Amino acid sequence: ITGTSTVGVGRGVLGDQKNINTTYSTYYYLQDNTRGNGIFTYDAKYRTTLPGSLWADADNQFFASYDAPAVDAHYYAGVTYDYYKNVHNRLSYDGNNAAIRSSVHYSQGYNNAFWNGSQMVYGDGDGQTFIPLSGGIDVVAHELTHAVTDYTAGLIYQNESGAINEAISDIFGTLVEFYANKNPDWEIGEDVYTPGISGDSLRSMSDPAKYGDPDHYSKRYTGTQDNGGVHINSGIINKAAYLISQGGTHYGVSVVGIGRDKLGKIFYRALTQYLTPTSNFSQLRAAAVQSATDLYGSTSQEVASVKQAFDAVGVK
Numbered sequence: 001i002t003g004t005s006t007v008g009v010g011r012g013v014l015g016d017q018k019n020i021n022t023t024y025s026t027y028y029y030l031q032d033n034t035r036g037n038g039i040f041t042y043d044a045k046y047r048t049t050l051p052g053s054l055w056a057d058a059d060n061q062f063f064a065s066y067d068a069p070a071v072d073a074h075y076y077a078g079v080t081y082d083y084y085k086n087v088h089n090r091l092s093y094d095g096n097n098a099a100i101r102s103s104v105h106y107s108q109g110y111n112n113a114f115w116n117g118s119q120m121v122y123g124d125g126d127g128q129t130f131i132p133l134s135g136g137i138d139v140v141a142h143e144l145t146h147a148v149t150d151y152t153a154g155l156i157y158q159n160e161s162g163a164i165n166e167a168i169s170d171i172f173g174t175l176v177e178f179y180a181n182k183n184p185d186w187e188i189g190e191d192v193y194t195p196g197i198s199g200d201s202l203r204s205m206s207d208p209a210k211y212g213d214p215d216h217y218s219k220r221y222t223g224t225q226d227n228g229g230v231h232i233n234s235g236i237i238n239k240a241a242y243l244i245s246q247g248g249t250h251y252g253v254s255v256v257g258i259g260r261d262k263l264g265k266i267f268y269r270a271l272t273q274y275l276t277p278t279s280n281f282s283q284l285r286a287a288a289v290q291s292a293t294d295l296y297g298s299t300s301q302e303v304a305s306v307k308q309a310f311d312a313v314g315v316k
């Protein structure tokens, strides 16, 4: 809608207070005009029809518990936009400042979030497995990164290309979490997963096997569930990314870490320059080596570390 840009205040899913960019025109709308062509947050009203209605609020204060998932979806989309712009010189997910849209309160007891090809969508969770999924910045950034992947490499959501697609979302999900400095870690979904149980998460990048995912190519899933294991075999790539950044010794192979910033640079380049819709793990290795070579030279420590990490997880 057309109106006056302003700033409102609200409380997120975890009870934290934050300022959000809104737009005033009779009502205050969750429409952020300060970033690209805008960030728009919608109320799906417990239904499955999308996007629902542009979130309207009478007083520019968002402290109702019904408001919380909208606050976080709106706010964390903004942070994710800032990350891609400031760190990678990318304007929104298409590189041309496309409007970013999210719907919250999708369906009832819905334990999931997704990019549907056009927008992000967040369930409220069932209150047991999940609380509202937009409450996690690594969740929001994971989703938005699916959009980035779709407009760049276009990795098919199936088998090894799908696992790479998933890992890219987990990796940048995590990098965005570190960027915002919000209790950052190498775990996925910890803020919104199992509110009854402390210290756990949905997946782990530092140790994927902790939650049943492979941390070595020899342990990959070869069946047909989960589109050929796209949320399972991603563990292999996630572990490699963890090693490149943090370093460590894994199945007897030692890796010197080069840190988060370079990890991000190398994988962003691979994603945008070298990966294709049907890239497999071995092609990912080649893309990452080539990207590090482009950026730091073929005899750099960076190239060496990328090679050791993929050796460590058994990807040749």
Ligand SMILES: O=C(O)C[C@H](NC(=O)OCc1ccccc1)C(=O)O
Residues within 6 Å of the ligand: 111, 112, 113, 114, 115, 133, 138, 139, 142, 143, 166, 188, 189, 202
């Ligand atoms: O597979 C899909 O299309 C949707 C799937 N969604 C999903 O797993 O929702 C929960 C969640 C997402 C990110 C981080 C932690 C938890 C995905 O985006 O991979």
Ligand SMILES: [Ca+2]
Residues within 6 Å of the ligand: 057, 058, 059, 060, 061, 062, 063
């Ligand atoms: Ca209000």
Ligand SMILES: [Ca+2]
Residues within 6 Å of the ligand: 177, 182, 183, 184, 185, 190, 191
């Ligand atoms: Ca965290």
Ligand SMILES: [Ca+2]
Residues within 6 Å of the ligand: 138, 174, 177, 184, 185, 186, 187, 188, 189, 190
């Ligand atoms: Ca996390």
Ligand SMILES: [Ca+2]
Residues within 6 Å of the ligand: 190, 192, 193, 194, 195, 196, 197, 198, 199, 200, 201
């Ligand atoms: Ca938990």
Ligand SMILES: [Zn+2]
Residues within 6 Å of the ligand: 142, 146, 166, 169
């Ligand atoms: Zn995903």
